[PDB]
Amino acid sequence: KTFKQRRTFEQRVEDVRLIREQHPTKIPVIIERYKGEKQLPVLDKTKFLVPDHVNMSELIKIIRRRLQLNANQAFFLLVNGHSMVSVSTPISEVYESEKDEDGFLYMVYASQETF
Ligand SMILES: COc1ccccc1-c1nnco1
Numbered sequence: 526k527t528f529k530q531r532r533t534f535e536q537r538v539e540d541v542r543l544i545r546e547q548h549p550t551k552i553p554v555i556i557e558r559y560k561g562e563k564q565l566p567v568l569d570k571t572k573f574l575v576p577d578h579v580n581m582s583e584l585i586k587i588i589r590r591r592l593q594l595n596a597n598q599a600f601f602l603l604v605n606g607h608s609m610v611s612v613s614t615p616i617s618e619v620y621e622s623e624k625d626e627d628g629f630l631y632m633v634y635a636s637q638e639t640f
């Protein structure tokens with residue numbers, strides 16, 4: 526079902542190196558619904574190219590716009606398995622510290638703060 530399940534470590538590594546070559550200013554982001562989630566819909570896609578200058582605050586707004594949420598629907602975004610320490614961090618900085626060994630930045634969303 527999940528991205529790591531669908532693609533070999535070889536295939537994920539090679540995709541990230543191609544994005545470097547073809548989208549050199551973009552951060553390669555996997556965004557997945559929490560396997561538990563009941564309230565929020567699933568995204569139309571899995572793999573996002575995020576401009577490397579937006580901070581996490583702007584990425585949360587983007588994703589809430591992609592899910593077409595409304596103001597008082599709750600939405601929580603884990604990065605590399607854990608809560609975000611701060612939303613003001615530029616995604617270029619977040620990438621360099623939170624990226625997986627395959628080169629993707631992994632994110633999971635829920636309506637619950639308890640995942
Ligand atoms: C195979 O090399 C690449 C081609 C494209 C982008 C990155 C790399 C790379 N970086 N570290 C190892 O490979």
Ligand SMILES: [Cl-]
Pocket residue numbers: 547548549550551
């Ligand atoms: Cl680019």
